[PDB]
Design a protein around this ligand. Structure first.
Ligand SMILES: Cc1cc2nc3c(=O)[nH]c(=O)nc-3n(C[C@H](O)[C@H](O)[C@H](O)COP(=O)(O)OP(=O)(O)OC[C@H]3O[C@@H](n4cnc5c(N)ncnc54)[C@H](O)[C@@H]3O)c2cc1C
Length: 460
């Protein structure tokens, strides 16, 4: 964290850098190096809080010339801890939060450090939206470059399926535009290939009109686990794009809507919504709400921005997390039973075994159209352990590991944006031989020195 820096190279950097630099001796250094995954404790030599594209140019070129290991940071939610490093530079984008929306053209230009909630707020000023993740403080930058799915995804695709161009700062310090008509090889790679190919300082999106959303959440006893998941699995195979339905197995929150008898016990929290007319959605949601007997049932007509802000109503921000995720082509009765066995052993009130159904518009993009793999797998299982006590790491990590291992045989692929710090190994398997090979050629061209290796890495 104290390498010798050449005063010449450093001087040129600050002359060209209009941002704020955070050094290990500064008082805000310890807070600035913390990311969402609180198990990641790392001490960069320097934190560069970039405020503009020229700032990112200055920082990238200062890292290349100085040979510093490069962490790039959007919203900080890397479950692998990629957005902070030991001994290098954090290229921090969090201050680059500015959005422009044209309601007439249904387009949004968003800087590379935006949080989802800032994006959704800006577009919803005009009743517009585009798919993103379900938790507002997730960074738009990392989420999009991995694909990005959420409430709107079954209707309007992944985030990358609404992305029309990017401004990206490559390792040599140049600034490029990547679109379907300009460096289209790089535009294929950034739509699914992570931060491997440069620092995206601006995303441009197509927008869709999204009015009020009929929404429901409820909790089921696990005694009805088998019926519920089986009805969930069977129904989403032929469900319309407009219905999104998700299962979150977890300890029941000690909330008033819920009988105190269920507090602190493993339950299925089913959340659903209808991206369409709210009268149709009311009928549609009631059709899928009694696969089991629903407790703490809350139904609401929400502005889309409120739906985006809903997940999840927790009492405490979890400090420590560990993830194991994977896709499934099918969810058999045998996998359902294993999912239910391991859900019953959930110990922390912050931990969720998530069961998602993508499909819809996601699965109708041709496989090779983006670098995002597994479009044809509809199911996503995510063993998402979360806790507070650093002395309980082993217990919560062991729950996700053994849950993943008993589901291994059914798992068919992995989402790069759910990889944990010990899963660099999984990269080529995750993308598949054909996609990986094309990504390596784009890397060889755009980042031959692998300047950007703090990601699900693709070596050139
Ligand atoms: C609580 C939580 C909820 C989530 N919900 C969803 C969800 O609903 N749907 C979904 O699809 N995913 C979801 N994710 C996963 C999310 O997409 C990834 O964790 C993503 O990497 C987070 O982006 P970030 O910028 O916040 O993370 P960071 O730690 O800042 O960055 C993650 C990676 O992206 C790179 N990166 C970030 N910004 C840029 C940029 N501008 N240019 C180049 N590289 C960049 C970083 O170098 C790093 O490798 C969730 C994650 C968390 C922790």
């Amino acid at each position: 964290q104290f390498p010798q820096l050449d005063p010449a190279t450093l001087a040129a950097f600050s002359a060209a850098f209009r941002g704020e630099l955070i050094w290990p001796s500064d008082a805000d250094y310890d807070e600035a190096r913390r990311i969402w995954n609180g198990t990641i404790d790392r001490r960069p030599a320097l934190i560069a809080r970039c405020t503009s594209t020229p700032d990112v140019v200055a920082a990238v070129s200062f890292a290349r010339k100085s040979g510093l290991l490069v962490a790039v940071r959007g919203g900080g939610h890397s479950m692998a801890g990629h957005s902070v490093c030991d001994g290098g530079i954090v290229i921090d984008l969090s201050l680059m939060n500015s959005i422009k929306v044209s309601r007439r053209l249904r387009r949004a230009r968003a800087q590379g450090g935006c949080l989802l909630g800032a994006f959704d707020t800006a577009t919803q000023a005009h009743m517009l939206a585009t798919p993103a993740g379900t938790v507002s403080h997730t960074g738009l930058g990392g989420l999009v470059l991995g694909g990005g799915f959420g409430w709107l995804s079954r209707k309007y695709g992944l985030s990358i399926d609404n992305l029309t161009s990017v401004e990206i700062v490559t390792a040599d310090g140049g600034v490029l535009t990547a679109s379907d008509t300009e460096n289209p090889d790089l535009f294929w790679a950034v739509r699914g290939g992570g931060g491997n190919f440069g620092v995206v300082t601006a995303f441009e999106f197509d927008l869709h009109r999204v009015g009020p959303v009929r929404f429901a959440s409820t909790y089921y006893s696990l005694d009805e686990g088998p019926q519920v998941i089986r009805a969930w699995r069977d129904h989403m195979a032929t469900a319309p794009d407009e219905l999104t339905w998700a299962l979150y197995l977890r300890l029941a929150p000690p909330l008033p809507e819920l009988p105190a008898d269920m507090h602190g016990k493993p339950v299925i929290c089913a959340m659903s919504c209808w991206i369409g007319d709210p009268h149709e959605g009311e009928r549609q949601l009631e059709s899928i709400l009694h696969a089991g007997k629903p407790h703490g049932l809350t139904k609401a007509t929400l502005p889309y921005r409120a739906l985006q802000a809903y997940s999840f109503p927790g009492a405490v921000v979890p400090d420590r997390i560990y993830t194991k995720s994977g896709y499934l082509n099918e969810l058999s009765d045998e996998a359902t039973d294993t999912v239910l066995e391991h859900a019953a052993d959930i110990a922390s009130p912050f931990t969720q075994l998530e069961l998602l159904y993508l499909g819809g518009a996601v699965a109708r993009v041709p496989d090779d159209a983006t670098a995002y793999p597994n479009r044809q797998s509809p199911f996503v299982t995510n063993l998402a352990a979360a806790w507070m006590d650093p002395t309980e790491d082993a217990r919560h990590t062991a729950w996700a590991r053994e849950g993943y291992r008993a589901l291994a045989g059914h798992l068919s692929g992995g989402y790069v944006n759910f990889m944990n710090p010990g899963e660099a190994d999984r990269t080529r398997e995750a993308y598949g031989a054909a996609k990986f090979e094309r990504l390596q050629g784009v890397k060889a061209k755009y980042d031959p020195t692998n300047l950007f290796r703090l990601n699900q890495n693709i070596p050139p």
